[PDB]
Design a protein around this ligand. Sequence first.
Ligand SMILES: *CC(=O)N1CCN(S(=O)(=O)c2c(F)cccc2F)CC1
Ligand SMILES: *CC(=O)N1CCN(S(=O)(=O)c2c(F)cccc2F)CC1
Lengths: 304, 304
Amino acid sequence: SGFRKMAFPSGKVEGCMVQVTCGTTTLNGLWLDDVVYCPRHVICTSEDMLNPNYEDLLIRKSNHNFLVQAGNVQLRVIGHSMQNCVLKLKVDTANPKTPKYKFVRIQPGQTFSVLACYNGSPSGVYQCAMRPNFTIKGSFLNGSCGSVGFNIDYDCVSFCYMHHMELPTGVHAGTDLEGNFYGPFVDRQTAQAAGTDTTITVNVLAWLYAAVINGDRWFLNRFTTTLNDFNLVAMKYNYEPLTQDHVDILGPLSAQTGIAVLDMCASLKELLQNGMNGRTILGSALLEDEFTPFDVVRQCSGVT
Amino acid sequence: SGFRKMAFPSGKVEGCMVQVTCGTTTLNGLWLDDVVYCPRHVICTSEDMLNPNYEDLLIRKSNHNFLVQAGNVQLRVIGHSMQNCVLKLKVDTANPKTPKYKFVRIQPGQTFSVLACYNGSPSGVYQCAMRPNFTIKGSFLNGSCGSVGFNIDYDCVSFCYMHHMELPTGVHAGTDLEGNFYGPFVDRQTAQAAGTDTTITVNVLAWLYAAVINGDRWFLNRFTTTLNDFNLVAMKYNYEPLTQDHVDILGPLSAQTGIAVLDMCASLKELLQNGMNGRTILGSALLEDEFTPFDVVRQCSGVT
Ligand SMILES: *CC(=O)N1CCN(S(=O)(=O)c2c(F)cccc2F)CC1
Ligand SMILES: *CC(=O)N1CCN(S(=O)(=O)c2c(F)cccc2F)CC1
């Protein structure tokens, strides 16, 4: 029993983190096989960052200008290329600690662990969601760029995020490991505002199921609703629309608790309309939306 | 910017987790040098658990009854002893991944990371505090016993907790790595109630400082207070008394923000008396108390 915001064990990803230095800019790189992946803005002077032309900036960089350090040993860079907003640095040594890995581009609402690093050294691990506006609400100081977000499936690390940007509002933006930004964000020190940070409805419901499973039942009510009726209330409260796809996904939790998805929807409807009235669910005074249905099943079943 | 509930990177501790089996009971062990530490209740039939006599139960166990598995390789047990509520299993192989380590007994209010394991395999990592009633609010299913809590100081893992018990109320109890329970708890399936789960006042203040540092300032007020005046309000709200020791500890955050500790106390006083009024601080609708002042400084400075 008990339910916690839980990150994947970070060891497999700690084994991949290196320091990348280009001139006076130091950030983090991900070392998989003989490639080091890092944000392309490593080549910028914070003056370049106002309107960088990356292809033009990169012409001035040779392999030997990229200083790659794994622990206290230098890696020899034998190649470099730009893919979208990341640099791939070919090194002469395969990372001996390379885990089984995939690159995946996640959807909004999908959760992942972040290993926050500075100078290629891990500081901490935390759980995130890709927000519906394609920002993440991270913890990233200067030097944290190139820190990565991941899921683990037993022994296979799926890398879904590399950190690039803090928006003026202190939310975060980054790329998949093909260098493609989540959302409309660009690696330029310019005015970039996030859209509406809506609540991930299906995640909230997952977490209400986690609550029932863990004995927090006070908010269960006598009501049901319909997707269309629920969705009117959701819209009004800046909750994402709920689809039959989300209902299907919640089916296993529905089964385990014997609470119909639409009944739990009706419960969530009353919490939105009535508020918590100073009560808590799983030690939270607000509705948590950074647990996916898969996260809830995982932590409630104890997958390793 | 941004502030997250952040666990230590778990890699150093993943390298220490083994499976311990005694008869039909499987749980987790911590492998440091040539010793495997695990809960002594590994020797119990859940029938033994009602009123176990551990010294008597242990007489019936030989080295070869303790099955220790690190990955998919068996360790040879060449010795076993009981220290308080843990077994020390001497094995013939030093853990080659043994990190620099200490055993520390933490005080209530102190935070640590837990690496939740099942069958010696990591499932997840999360951040905890030792509650003032010497429980922790964990996420632990059957098989999780012997999962450990730790702090890291650069390269030195301080182990402070091993998981043993879920109380009937679904809160958690365990030992330091000398086998001594935190609080008055015993490894027996009996009526054990926790005392008052009071709020860790100094941690709440730390987290209010983290909020100001990260731009969440709305709750800063025009008032100050005194320790004695603050403490009357704290008592009324089941907050731990604040000492000059806690004020001293908050000094660095006081300095960085230019907010006197007692001013921040007066802010916390108004939040207790007035509530949040539907507002959030660092994405929370309640006052977070599982960040220590050291945690706030660490994450706000980016220590690795
Ligand atoms: C995002 C990231 O981690 N980095 C890119 C920016 N640089 S930097 O330009 O060197 C820099 C500092 F070193 C300190 C403060 C601001 C700043 F932009 C850091 C690495
Ligand atoms: C605390 C812990 O992880 N364990 C001790 C109890 N045992 S058990 O007695 O084998 C057991 C199960 F295997 C399943 C359900 C309940 C139960 F007590 C599990 C390991």
